[PDB]
Design an enzyme around this catalytic site. Sequence first.
Site, PDB file in Angstrom:
ATOM      1  N   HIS A   1      -7.518  -5.752   0.548  1.00  0.00           N
ATOM      2  CA  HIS A   1      -6.350  -4.920   0.542  1.00  0.00           C
ATOM      3  C   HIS A   1      -5.594  -5.274   1.814  1.00  0.00           C
ATOM      4  O   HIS A   1      -6.142  -5.157   2.899  1.00  0.00           O
ATOM      5  CB  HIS A   1      -6.755  -3.474   0.612  1.00  0.00           C
ATOM      6  CG  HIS A   1      -5.638  -2.502   0.385  1.00  0.00           C
ATOM      7  ND1 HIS A   1      -4.883  -2.493  -0.774  1.00  0.00           N
ATOM      8  CD2 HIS A   1      -5.216  -1.443   1.122  1.00  0.00           C
ATOM      9  CE1 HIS A   1      -4.056  -1.463  -0.744  1.00  0.00           C
ATOM     10  NE2 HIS A   1      -4.238  -0.811   0.393  1.00  0.00           N
TER      11      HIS A   1
ATOM     12  N   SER B   1       0.848  -1.196   0.000  1.00  0.00           N
ATOM     13  CA  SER B   1       0.000   0.000   0.000  1.00  0.00           C
ATOM     14  C   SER B   1       0.887   1.251   0.000  1.00  0.00           C
ATOM     15  O   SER B   1       1.737   1.364  -0.837  1.00  0.00           O
ATOM     16  CB  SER B   1      -0.906  -0.023   1.223  1.00  0.00           C
ATOM     17  OG  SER B   1      -2.115   0.597   0.876  1.00  0.00           O
TER      18      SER B   1
ATOM     19  N   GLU C   1      -8.928  -5.103  -4.086  1.00  0.00           N
ATOM     20  CA  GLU C   1      -8.310  -3.999  -3.399  1.00  0.00           C
ATOM     21  C   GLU C   1      -9.346  -3.032  -2.842  1.00  0.00           C
ATOM     22  O   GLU C   1      -9.159  -2.481  -1.740  1.00  0.00           O
ATOM     23  CB  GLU C   1      -7.362  -3.243  -4.340  1.00  0.00           C
ATOM     24  CG  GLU C   1      -6.245  -4.060  -4.931  1.00  0.00           C
ATOM     25  CD  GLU C   1      -5.141  -4.381  -3.922  1.00  0.00           C
ATOM     26  OE1 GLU C   1      -5.271  -4.018  -2.724  1.00  0.00           O
ATOM     27  OE2 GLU C   1      -4.129  -4.994  -4.322  1.00  0.00           O
TER      28      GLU C   1
END
Lengths: 528, 528
Positions: free
Chosen positions: B437, B197, B324
Amino acid sequence: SELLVNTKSGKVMGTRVPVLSSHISAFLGIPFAEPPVGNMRFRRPEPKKPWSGVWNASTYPNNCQQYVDEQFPGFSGSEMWNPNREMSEDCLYLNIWVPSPRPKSTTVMVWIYGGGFYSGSSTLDVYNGKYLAYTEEVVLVSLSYRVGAFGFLALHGSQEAPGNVGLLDQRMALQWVHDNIQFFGGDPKTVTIFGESAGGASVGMHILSPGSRDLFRRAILQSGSPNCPWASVSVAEGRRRAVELGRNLNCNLNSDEELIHCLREKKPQELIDVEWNVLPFDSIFRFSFVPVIDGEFFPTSLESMLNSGNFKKTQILLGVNKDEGSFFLLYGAPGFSKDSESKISREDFMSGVKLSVPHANDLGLDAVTLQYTDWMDDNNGIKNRDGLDDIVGDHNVICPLMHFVNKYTKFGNGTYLYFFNHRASNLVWPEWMGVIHGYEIEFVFGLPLVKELNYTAEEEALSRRIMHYWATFAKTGNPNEPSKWPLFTTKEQKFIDLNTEPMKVHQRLRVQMCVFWNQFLPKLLNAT
Amino acid sequence: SELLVNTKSGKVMGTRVPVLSSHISAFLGIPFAEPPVGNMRFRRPEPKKPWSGVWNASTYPNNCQQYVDEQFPGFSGSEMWNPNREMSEDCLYLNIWVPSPRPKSTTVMVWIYGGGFYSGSSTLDVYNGKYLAYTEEVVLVSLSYRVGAFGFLALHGSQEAPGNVGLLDQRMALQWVHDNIQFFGGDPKTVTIFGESAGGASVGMHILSPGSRDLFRRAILQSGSPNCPWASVSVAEGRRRAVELGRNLNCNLNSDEELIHCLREKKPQELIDVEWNVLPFDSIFRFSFVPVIDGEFFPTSLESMLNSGNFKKTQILLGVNKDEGSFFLLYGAPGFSKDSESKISREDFMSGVKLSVPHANDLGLDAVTLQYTDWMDDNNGIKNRDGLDDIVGDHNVICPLMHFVNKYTKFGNGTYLYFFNHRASNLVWPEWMGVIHGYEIEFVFGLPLVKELNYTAEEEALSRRIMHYWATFAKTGNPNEPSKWPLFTTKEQKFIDLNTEPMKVHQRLRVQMCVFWNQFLPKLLNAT
Ligand SMILES: c1ccc2c(NCCCCCCCNc3c4c(nc5ccccc35)CCCC4)c3c(nc2c1)CCCC3
Ligand SMILES: c1ccc2c(NCCCCCCCNc3c4c(nc5ccccc35)CCCC4)c3c(nc2c1)CCCC3
Ligand SMILES: *[C@@H]1O[C@H](CO)[C@@H](O)[C@H](O)[C@H]1NC(C)=O
Ligand SMILES: *[C@@H]1O[C@H](CO)[C@@H](O)[C@H](O)[C@H]1NC(C)=O
Ligand SMILES: *[C@@H]1O[C@H](CO)[C@@H](O)[C@H](O)[C@H]1NC(C)=O
Ligand SMILES: *[C@@H]1O[C@H](CO)[C@@H](O)[C@H](O)[C@H]1NC(C)=O
């Protein structure tokens, strides 16, 4: 005598014609207007002056002056659409096929031919009304109308070349059917107008025009609708094209009178020789002289008329073919040819989309290209060919028709929608072209019933099915005899496939692409 | 002694930790910078002053000051990301796990945590380096860095709060690894930075920044890339947010000095309490304080740097997860909830797209909606949920990463691309969220190797596979031991799925949607 009929304009003498080993009467070449010649060219039509004596209606009339396709000399595929009679500005005639014995008050069908408003004839073999007249016991009429500049030169404001006169030719023939079809056994309270391509657009135009609504009962539209992007132009664009037509003939351009007078002294072929030079863009599926939104024949814009319910409310039956676009790419897009599979390169694909959406800027052209490209296989020649084919058909025929049906259904009294996707067995066009623009006509007119034309037995069965749907709908407002073709409703949006396989009902015909063509692209071109 | 190490900054004393019934050494909380407190807040970090005596590195350090998620109190799913140590502005520490016996010159891996640049800790249980250090015989480092306003308040031009200081914290810890990892058995000629991320975006940022390129050899990016729409802002936007932060605390706004001085007298929690009030739009997946394109850390715009090859050329391994976007819709989009299947209505879908593409006008919002809507089934709650999920993920993670990989590969020395789509068996989040995610991290750190955590045997096998790919690639520049993960090339664009099923190679990861997000939409928003 069965072949002699007295009408309000005089007596006409028909001829007996054979049909599937029987016979029916035909009255060909009946005049419904004064010849639009000399000082009459470009002008509104005048009703034919009554005659004494007996009019000989035993042979087809002349076809109107038009461009003649010479791309594939002698090839039947394209030759079958060209005029099969001497051309002449004296062409305002209509044809009638009457069952025998003569009916008393039966269902009437009036055919309006297509051909992009620049061509077309009522005398073509695929338009032979005897099979339908005979098989369904209907009085079949095919009218004619001025095309090209002769029919649609538009100098709004002037009364010598006001525009839309070819639409007025149709209306006049419709007024004649209204006034005289009773003498031929036809019920004037029950006439269905039906047409294909520009003829289908025309039909929708009579549904919208206040001055035409009372002359017919029901309507059938095949691969065409009034709001098609190629079927009309503004008065300003019509004016700019009439003037450019003038500039191409070295006409004096100082007044409408000077322009019109010059255009009237020219031989028919001089106008046809430069007709295509007035198109504003390099394009595919666009025609020079077409109907104009003039405030008279069309009181306001077509879209506001559709939005407000400003149109004849009745029943309609309409549809499209699977590959409306192939024919136009063959004729004007690079990479396509009649004798090859026509696998298209990305470069030709892109020059193909530019040609197909002539009125679009770069952002719009990028939107069309993204919508029709499989990016996992962008260099697949067959996918490019097929994508371009759908682009032409979606944008020019299918999505405008779906927008018309959805707007109509909100106010009409019944809609029946079809998708014709049968590739005929004796088709002489290459496979890649699929179910071609215009190739459902032969089934509507019932050509598969004649053995010598080599159709299969199931094709004959489909033709009879279609003819019976078309005529049952003309007689009652519903194609079904009291396996069902469901009504198309605002909610369900059902339609049927029309082929040799068992009937299947589906919903939302090409919604995905039509939302793009009817709602997204127009908005995009408006903002940018 | 194995737990005593002399570094250029002084001696540190580690602790022996158990791992899968063996042991390795851990040096936790080693300082690499002077505490950025008092007048130091918002400022570039200073190298830690050497110390005499022995630094106690047997326990985790404090985590940096950050917002604490309280949406699902006690729920492990979200609790596992929150700080598990007292928070403190004194947080610039790094952690080292060293195989036992101590290596001589082995492969080094430096982990950079994510958390949208506003949160994150190096001490989380899913970031425990002992399993990877142990299983792959690598020296594993996890660094830390200032987040939120403390790390990214940006008043360009001023030297007291220049912006990007959290990126500089990372760079400093990387300079320390470069200068001292040899004493722990690490080869500084072979350090791989990897992160997820914001950590994955950070990694890419060090690849681009001239001042960071020489401090590492290879890079791994997980679900993040430098060009992500949420990872950076212009100096002007950074300035406007710093000022608005100031306005929220009733600070004097007459000079950078007045603003900064006021922000420095505030307790940490006062800044965190109003941090989210400076976002310019109502949005999802956007964070207040993030890196700024300042002309120093980033010499020019990211896109021109990517276009011209202005970046470290080496090998990279990167990828994305199947879903995600689900986590961000759960947190900020109407209609989603943790305890229901979250079928979304068209209305919520549309308010969902507005939230997801905050920077778009009406035409752009219509383009996204058309691209993700199945118009044959527009009111299908599951299709709406899933479409919105892909919109968030495509726009925020997947398409920006694909644009980065395609630009990188034109100049780099080797790229390996993955798509992680395994839904773990013990996942505590609802099914509709899919492969979330951040949920590939536990496999990268090898949590499925510990029985008590309830993974299946095949999940343990996948984890070992991933750990071995990650470490083999860190050691050699290729994840394969000399079934193959093909190299991603500009031409073929191959990638692999990463799950429990046999390896499958595919091509052009989400090309269809990414052409829309990377080429079409940006152009559309630019013209209108
Ligand atoms: C006037 C009009 C067109 C012109 C033109 N190109 C365009 C020539 C196109 C000829 C196609 C024949 C239609 N013929 C067709 C029809 C149907 N389907 C078909 C299906 C396949 C093939 C032809 C078809 C359905 C019903 C309507 C008619 C050109 C010129 N002048 C023109 C002047 C000058 C030179 C450049 C080209
Ligand atoms: C600062 C920052 C955010 C703020 C905020 N909303 C936003 C709160 C969001 C909390 C999610 C926790 C992250 N936690 C996560 C992470 C990952 N995956 C996850 C997956 C599922 C759930 C959480 C995840 C991958 C690695 C990165 C971290 C709000 C406010 N202030 C903030 C002030 C004021 C009130 C309005 C909401
Ligand atoms: C009608 O015209 C045709 C064709 O010109 C001719 O052969 C036929 O004999 C005519 N009939 C009469 C009575 O005029
Ligand atoms: C058509 O109109 C009739 C009478 O006006 C009405 O009863 C009928 O429901 C209508 N049919 C449709 C399909 O609208
Ligand atoms: C290191 O710190 C821990 C935790 O505060 C303590 O328990 C341990 O005994 C310390 N060791 C030394 C020698 O300082
Ligand atoms: C990487 O660089 C080496 C030497 O510079 C070269 O021989 C090799 O082909 C490169 N590998 C790739 C995938 O570019």
